[PDB]
């Protein structure tokens, strides 16, 4: 199974930015509150406006992440010296496009700008995670980290910002995004654990957790309100996710049968391989219409599980003569969560660079 073809991964589009005319409001504030020449900080203002145009049209590569993190950190450093939040003195309109409707949504709130950047940091991480072939140890590790970082950005957004600046960043949609991203992170780790040939029981538990994360996403996708908001995106996500629930349930029970093999529980081995085959047959049904990438992974896995089942049953029928337990007596596999949303510290100097606005007060 370490050589199974990789399943495709879902990634999220980045949001499109509108205007954020911060320069006039910063100049008035410096004049009326610091008493200094309003244009003594034009080079700091020039650095920020350049950084914004770079961020709102960011390159879709790993370097793009540092650009977004730079701009996000510098917005924090600006907010801590110039009050531009909701209701505050120097607040100006911030406009971005809500991604599911295409409608412009404006708020006079610098935290809306921060939120949309953080959203795009999560989305870019999801795209970089989904781009790798995931065939090397380092590519599997890096993809896993990108999906955890994506989860981290959407989780931070959900926890630290006035909920619902727009409906693409509502708490329930962000939670769907987190659970999908963690499910994809855990899938990357499952692939890595099979390459590393970890203990069969641990691999089963890792796979069971992939199922658990994808069940959380699937339940959220079945919410009619979310289906309505996402439109055909909900159909495309749900088809892949529901298929993967049965696929990784098959992979889990395959590895429970390998544990039984190792323990010389040869009737239990047959039962788990039979259950794995039943779960895989449902996944193949649910995969109708999916791309060849999905079919190639399922075809490969059917060869593995079908061959293991036929030989386990032959061995048991002609050698071991052990009783085969009913499938509904098998101990369920408890997922092993080995991923988490990974930090967004917006003001870590190692990532923000020098504070553009250090020479303010």
Author numbering: 1 to 361
Paper text:
However, the two hydrophobic pockets, critical for binding of the CHMP4 peptides, are occluded in the apo-HD-PTPBro1 structure, requiring several side-chain conformational changes to accommodate the peptides. This may contribute to maintaining HD-PTP in an inactive status by minimizing interactions between cytosolic pools of CHMP4 and HD-PTP. In contrast, these pockets are fully open in the apo structures of Alix and Brox (McCullough et al., 2008, Mu et al., 2012). In the apo-HD-PTPBro1 structure these are blocked by the side chains of K141, K192, and R198. Thus, binding of CHMP4A/B/C to HD-PTPBro1 requires rearrangement of these side chains to accommodate the critical CHMP4 Leu and Trp residues. A major finding from the structural analysis is that the endofin and SARA binding site expands from the common site to a neighboring specific pocket (S site), not occupied by the CHMP4 peptides and fully accessible in the apo-HD-PTPBro1 structure. Significantly, the S site appears fully open and accessible in the structure of the apo-HD-PTPBro1, and no major conformational changes are observed upon binding of SARA/endofin peptides.
